[PDB]
Paper text:
Secreted PAPP-A is a 1547-residue, multidomain, dimeric glycoprotein which recognizes and cleaves IGFBP2, 4 and 510–17, while PAPP-A2 mainly cleaves IGFBP3 and 59,17–21. The proteolytic cleavage of IGFBPs is required for the release of sequestered IGFs to enable their binding to insulin-like growth factor receptors (IGFRs) for downstream signaling. We show that PAPP-A is a flexible trans-dimer that binds IGFBP5 via a 25-amino acid anchor peptide which extends into the metalloprotease active site.
To facilitate the understanding of IGFBP5 recognition, we further obtained the cryo-EM map of substrate-unbound PAPP-A (E483A) at ~3.35 Å. The two structures share the same overall domain architecture and no obvious conformational change was observed in the IGFBP5 binding groove. There were slight differences in some loops around the substrate binding groove, but this is likely due to the limited resolution and the flexibility of these loops rather than representing specific conformational differences. However, there may be subtle differences in substrate binding due to this mutation that we are not able to distinguish. As aforementioned, multibody refinement of PAPP-ABP5 and substrate-unbound PAPP-A showed that in the later structure, the two monomers have more obvious rotation, suggesting the substrate association helps to stabilize the PAPP-A trans-dimer. While we used the catalytically inactive PAPP-A (E483A) for structure work, the Zn2+ coordination remains intact, which is a validation of the state of the active site.
Numbering used by the authors:
A (entry chain A): 102 to 142, 879 to 1263
B (entry chain B): 12 to 336, 403 to 1171, 1186 to 1201
Write the structure that this text describes.
């Protein structure tokens, strides 16, 4: 048999409307014309009577949803159907809220300081009981609290030795994942008559290298269920995984329903390995490959008066080829046909990119510049083929600077300097 | 026969090689031993090749010499090699790595192979360039070349000694340079060595210039130096006891800290009737008893000798400490009613070389009660030095641990917070950022601490420099500023300093006649097949002769050479009314911390307060003059003058107009004008004076010339030093010697042992002997005969060696203790060391430190994107704001606390020159710049390259900058306020981004600062090469990568791996026709069938869940 209760307490001395409808598949309960509960095992209500979801001021009450015209209002928190907007509020229906682009992994195994049959420590494993609203200023924890939660049952309430009892619990997950946030769903807030002050829980994250990273001290309250503790990471430092989460507190009344790690979807720091541009990380192989389905093949590239040495026989994706200039030629490298930083060394690495080359390399000859009085004074340097490498051309000393010698021509040498004048005029 | 040498006086003495040699053209090597005296000309050409006929350009050829770089500021001189072929468009100069040391022999070798120019100083490659290529000159012009030695035609003369001049025709490698270092003329008739001169006869291959101006052929000692006994103190230290090894010897050895009885004398002023004491006998008794009880646990036992001075006039007059000058207060009138401490010391004239005098004077404001004279101070051991204490706080409970603090200050103990709260700026390398022997207090045991009036570990706060959370601070240390009830002990690393300074400086206070031990262990010079040679340093006290009271044995050097400073200064100018820059500051040993920085510890010809308040004092013909007098008149050989600060206009062009030596007979010898620099003291060699000299007169036409000290080196075997008795040494070895030489008096300090056996282990130590009194044994040296050691040419890494170049000399790139030097990299089996930083080649270890070689070091897995657009709050033509665009100029070295920023800073960085310098408006104007980047990306860190720390001379407090990040939506995400320090000039500001909040794309970076002295040469974003917010945007299971549309491609293969699925008694509704990767197909169980799940999702051909309808 299945029973469904109303939404609020009965009001003495009032007229109420009760309607129960059962079609053989679904049964519902209607109070004052409004659907309060249903199971299958702003507003205008044509009245000015409260309790049916719409007040006399035509205002929708809390924990009610009103549709249609005239407005019919029904209860949505706990009805068993997770609507498009119940995720944020209705914990008892949709569980916990997972933001778009995140994944929540709940605790797989748990280790606590005090393990006993009546208060087992493996209750905070798996999905918690989000339908349980926490209890404030609780006196006894023997009713259902130990069923879907954990608490130090073996430890009585301490009055003087409570300052030295360091309660701790460590939760290990099946898989290691980068910790973006820590979810702590509670069932107790730690408030008590004998201990008015609450308890602040400090959470420590344990990595795969057994190192503890402190997340700081954070307060704990019922209004913040589930308690989301962000993981503040220094972006300059490399990311680190996490496999175990440690929760530390001193108040024996602190009971945790569940501990979970909220992480991003993919781009894990496993891909922080040697998987750079030109290759795609494998689905699950602990390694990165470069040819899954990409047809990114670049055509063979040749540079005039230059030396090319490719690291691979074929100029396929990820193939880096070193380019150097012949003696008497300078190296000019332009990334994506644009002016960028040059290469100090005599070799430039060019990588294939989806049928195109990342940078263009040119071995232009070294210009020796137009000669002047620096090389030979009182002379005219008239010569046809410019001032590039190998482009020899002569001079003529004007009157009265008579020139004596067999040769009176220079030659722009391989080091970018004009050759020694074999004859000097006086 | 002993080698000869040439002396060039720098006044016209030059030589030219004859025309019968064919000078090298394609490649060459020059090797020369040279001893350069201080105060050279700029540029003093040691030797160079010059072209006379070619008048269009007269820089053709090469030139080696000494020239000053940064001649505008601090003018420091270095060895330079300059070359310009007949093809290159300019001259190329390569300098040494450090300022040249005067009076020391240097092996200078400059090589050129046709592609590179290399310059080795003492065999270590200190400069390398490759701008010049090709031959130096063609054969046709070969007849128009002249090799000049000692100067050029333009009188770029050289002043000093030259020896063993070798000029080659091929570029000798560093190995051959080192091998040819030791030959000293043992060169065969090679057909490759062009010229080798040992100056047997100058006219064999050289000819003089002018008419008869020729250098002086003299005899030079053939470098008997086999051990570098000159151990330079660290940068932060002041004396030899600050050296790492010398103080480590005291830290480890317990025989170096034997009990010591250190005398001290307490001054008690009395009236003529012996009443009214300054401090009662009870007070002095209590203070002395407490001091003895607090020092006797550190093996020091003070001996008290109270002094009774009965002078009513002195007692009546009020004595004041650190005061600058019954009711008469006229300073001129002798009946004034006040006396400074130094005036009291001058009146008393107490001999402080035998006692630690305690002087009493009121110190009305009491936060530094005890004024102590440091051991390295000039006044440490004379009448005007001692301890100054408040008489009312001398022997009263709660006012007693102030004498121990002053005494510790008098034994060379810095305050424990010296590296934190006693630094001018955060860029000072003397900050104890970590416990070290070379920074701050120079004690490893004392943890860094800030200044604190109370005791107890101070928590985080507004640090003066910017470092918070000091842990394990020595709040209970004596040298801290705690109270008298919570300071209890000296750490057993600060006691070692006290014992070192008692052995070194204060040997006269103690009555025990134990000569100071040899501080450092004997060094194994080399082993033969059956012997060994050991050498050791002189005693730590620095004296070589026995100490005799009233004699000159305390100044005699090793070769009976008497070395003395000035002892009686004078001047015709009336002295300063304030007293600063008095002639008395030009006495004793040099005491200036930094060259050419106007200090009150020198003699300035016009002290005054404001310049040009007095009409020109020094006249045109002769100028002002300082007359120094030496204690012991004698016949001198060399004279050294420490000229510290010279005005910019008088850039060594006659700063010291004359130096007149005054004879005992009264005749005057004029030396003529000299040249002076900052760092190098001006040294002169006096040539056949022939008669005793008692004083000098230094003339000057400069109104800011600051003479710091003087010196008068005597001739060898001076009459005074003959009667001195040299110290002797006794070497003991772990197996006892068969016969023990009772005294090994070796002027080289060398011991040759022949009673050795192969495969055995021996230990050697040295005991000093002064007459019949022995000393504490020197630290033992271990020697395994037939095995390796330090100084054998083989790098045995198991012994801690990192370089071993077969020698025992510092400055060659490998330290004396087989340790690598600073900024020197040593390779090959005999360690050839070269100056790696800046040689144009970036190696594997130069990446993380050499900013100007390898650029900014980007860690693996990251990527630096520099600014592509800039904007500033103040833009001007003189100081443009677009300089920071692009990669920065890493060659620039940061400058701290400089008033003028126009020295090329704007050409490489941006600084706000538009604003005026504010005296009180510095907090009213906020400066900012904003740099936009070409490609916005994630912000992992911000890199800001700085040129200045933004510190002013009048503001010791540093500056802080606030950096803000702007995302693609122009939202300011502040990164925090960060201090400005040039010890980490590439400023890395990490980004602390919470992992829950989605990452943004930073478009621009905004950086704000207050003071206008801050200069930025570039702002960049350090970001991950891979990963981005685009991955988090929309890329689910099966979406690998799409084109540039901030998305991933949904169908990238894996569309046929999953075969057709069949479920019994179930209905399949497939959204997609083909069961591709992650395909969704709803499964509905028929009526009466229970649904079991283990919408199914395909996963690489395998269904993620199993659906059945039972
Ligand atoms: Zn002090």
């Amino acid at each position: 048999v299945t029973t469904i209760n109303a939404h609020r307490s009965y009001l003495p001395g009032q007229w109420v409307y009760l309607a129960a409808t059962y079609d053989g598949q679904f049964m519902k309960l209607y109070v004052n014309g409004a659907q309060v509960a249903t199971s299958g095992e702003q507003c205008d209500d044509m009245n000015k009577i409260n309790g049916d979801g719409c007040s006399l001021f035509c205002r929708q009450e809390v924990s009610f949803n009103c549709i249609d015209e005239p407005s019919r209002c029904y209860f949505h928190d706990g009805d068993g159907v997770c609507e498009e907007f119940e995720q944020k509020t209705s914990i008892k229906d949709c569980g916990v809220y997972t933001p778009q682009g995140f994944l929540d992994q709940w605790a797989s195994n748990a280790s606590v300081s005090h393990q006993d049959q009546q208060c087992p420590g493996w209750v905070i494993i798996g999905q918690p009981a989000a339908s349980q609203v926490c209890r404030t200023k609780v006196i006894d924890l023997s009713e259902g609290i130990s069923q879907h939660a954990w608490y130090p049952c073996t430890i009585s309430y301490p009055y003087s030795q409570l300052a030295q009892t360091t309660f701790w619990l460590r939760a290990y997950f099946s898989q290691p994942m980068v910790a973006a946030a820590v979810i702590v769903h509670l069932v107790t807030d730690g408030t008590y008559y004998g201990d008015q002050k609450q308890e602040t829980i400090s959470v420590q994250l344990l990595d795969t290298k057994d190192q503890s990273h402190d997340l700081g001290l954070h307060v704990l309250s019922c209004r913040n269920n589930p308690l989301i503790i962000p993981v503040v990471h220094d972006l300059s430092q490399p990311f680190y995984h996490s496999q175990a989460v440690r929760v530390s507190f001193s108040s024996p009344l602190v009971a945790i329903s569940g501990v979970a790690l909220r992480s991003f979807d993919n781009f894990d720091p496993v891909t922080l390995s040697s998987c750079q541009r030109g290759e795609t990380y494998s689905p699950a192989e602990q390694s990165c490959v470069h040819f899954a389905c990409e047809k990114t093949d670049c055509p063979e590239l040749a540079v005039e008066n230059a030396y090319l040495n490719c690291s691979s026989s074929d100029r396929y994706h990820g193939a880096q080829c070193t380019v150097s200039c012949r003696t008497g030629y300078v190296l000019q490298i332009r990334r994506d046909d644009e002016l960028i930083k040059s290469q100090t060394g005599p070799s430039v690495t060019v990588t294939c990119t989806e049928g195109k080359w990342n940078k263009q390399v040119a071995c232009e000859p070294v210009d020796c510049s137009i000669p002047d009085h620096h090389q030979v004074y009182a002379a005219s340097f008239s010569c046809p083929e410019g001032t590039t490498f190998g482009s020899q051309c002569s001079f003529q000393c004007r009157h009265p600077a008579q020139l004596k010698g067999n040769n009176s021509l220079l030659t722009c040498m391989e080091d970018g300097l004009w050759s020694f004048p074999e004859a000097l005029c006086e």
